[PDB]
Amino acid sequence: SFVGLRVVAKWSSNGYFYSGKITRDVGAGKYKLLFDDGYECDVLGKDILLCDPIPLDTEVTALSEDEYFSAGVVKGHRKESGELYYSIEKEGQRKWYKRMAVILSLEQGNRLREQYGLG
């Protein structure tokens, strides 16, 4: 089973992919997801990316408290007291983002589907 595995999955109301965990196989090609922000949905495997961390050189969308969000490229990982941090590079410079500060646009997620998709 996939229960307990960290994933990145599509939130279908806005088309973005967010980090979370599979918590149960609910059949019919779907999995119960506890997203890192607390919300759940039974999601199709085809909309789930089984990839933790998000791989190096992956184009992602990086969030921030002080600036509007945009696309960057993963260039590093770092683990500290049990938490994952990403090093994202935009227009040359690199910066660090918590796991919840990294999401994928619809197309960014659709790109990883062939290699990491559960469907």
């Binding site: 973005y16 969030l63 969000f69």
Partner: peptide, 7 residues
Amino acid sequence: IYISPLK
């Protein structure tokens, strides 16, 4: 909490 797309 980050500036992020509407959810």
